[PDB]
Amino acid sequence: GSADETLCQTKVLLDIFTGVRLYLPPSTPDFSRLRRYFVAFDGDLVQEFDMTSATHVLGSRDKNPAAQQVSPEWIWACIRKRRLVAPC
Numbered sequence: 001g002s003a004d005e006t007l008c009q010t011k012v013l014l015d016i017f018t019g020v021r022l023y024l025p026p027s028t029p030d031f032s033r034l035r036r037y038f039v040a041f042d043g044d045l046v047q048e049f050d051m052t053s054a055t056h057v058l059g060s061r062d063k064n065p066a067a068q069q070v071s072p073e074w075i076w077a078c079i080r081k082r083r084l085v086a087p088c
Contacts, residue, residue: 002076007033016079017043022056022070022087023063029072034058038075056087 006012011033021044024034039045046054051064061069070078070087077085 002073003030003033006076006080007037011037011040012079013037013041014079014082015042016075016082017041017056017084019043020056020068020070020078020084020087021046021054022058022068022074023048023051023054024058025060028058034072034075037079041079 017038019042022038024031024038024045025048028034035045044055048063051057051067054064054067056070057064057067059069059071061067068087074085074087
């Protein structure tokens with residue numbers, strides 16, 4: 001249990017993706033909060049077909065190789081580490 005053990009606090013958010021602009025895919029699980037939550041932390045979310053300027057990207061990068069190919073584990077590990085961790 002990650003989210004339920006992390007975002008279980010309303011949104012906790014925390015200074016995780018601090019300035020971490022990861023492209024949160026709509027196909028990603030927990031997207032609901034994944035979006036608001038993340039960006040809510042203090043970062044930003046770019047639409048797949050919209051990253052060129054983006055910074056991070058959830059699963060995959062193509063749309064934006066200049067972003068970060070982070071996953072759902074990164075958000076937790078990050079928000080949990082109160083500091084952006086190794087994106088993968």
